[PDB]
Aurora kinase A
Amino acid sequence: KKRQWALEDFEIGRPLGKGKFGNVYLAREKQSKFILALKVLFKAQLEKAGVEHQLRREVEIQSHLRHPNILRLYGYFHDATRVYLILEYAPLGTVYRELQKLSKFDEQRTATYITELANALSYCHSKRVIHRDIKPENLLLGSAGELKIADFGWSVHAPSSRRDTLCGTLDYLPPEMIEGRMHDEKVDLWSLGVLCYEFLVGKPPFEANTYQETYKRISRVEFTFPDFVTEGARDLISRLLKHNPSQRPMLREVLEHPWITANS
Ligand SMILES: O=C(O)c1ccc(Nc2nccc(Nc3ccccc3C(=O)O)n2)cc1
């Protein structure tokens, strides 16, 4: 690295999105004309949530990991009242919008995203990095439409223990992370299972009206397949969404699954 920037090196463009600790803007590196994403955090909005030692992880991890399906993080710098992150810019938005845009995905688009996803995960896992936060809203799209994993905020070394207060929805967490038990790389395989189901049905398999009824549905692994989901998909999803971490497949089996060869 060896490059410390300032808000003055970038011409902020249109607001890409968000509203949490801050926003994400399209931005232009004045010197080289380079285009990227600049995510701003108000600093104050962070401290009062103690992410200090977690946003620290988001920045450090996502910085060293380099893979075509991982969103690259270039560097960062703090304002007088803020903290900006210099991220790779993903031209086609989040996968979350792609969904509200098509409702469901076909078996080739689902099989392909699941592929790129498994490869990308197999990499982080090659390095004991577990994401634990695979939402279709933490999945971007590169200029050629390839899936790109982002927001390694909840990322962590593994095997590990979850203190973590686990704020938002449970739609994507496995019985172990929700019943606050220990866990490993296998948590990212249950998530891959959910995504697959969501990419094909339009909603997650455990979706509920309350955090509490989802919690049940998850721990008891209670999910059903609408009539259109093909067998080959039910199979893979049923293989991934098994309660016992050790019984879920490896990524090879996922990248080799018969039905997975209905992609690109
Ligand atoms: O549709 C659009 O206009 C749209 C949405 C997304 C992108 N890409 C992009 N690139 C880099 C970072 C990034 N962060 C986010 C942007 C909005 C919401 C959440 C995030 C995030 O941090 O995951 N989003 C481009 C256009």
Observations:
- The CA atoms of residues 15 and 51 lie 23 Å apart.
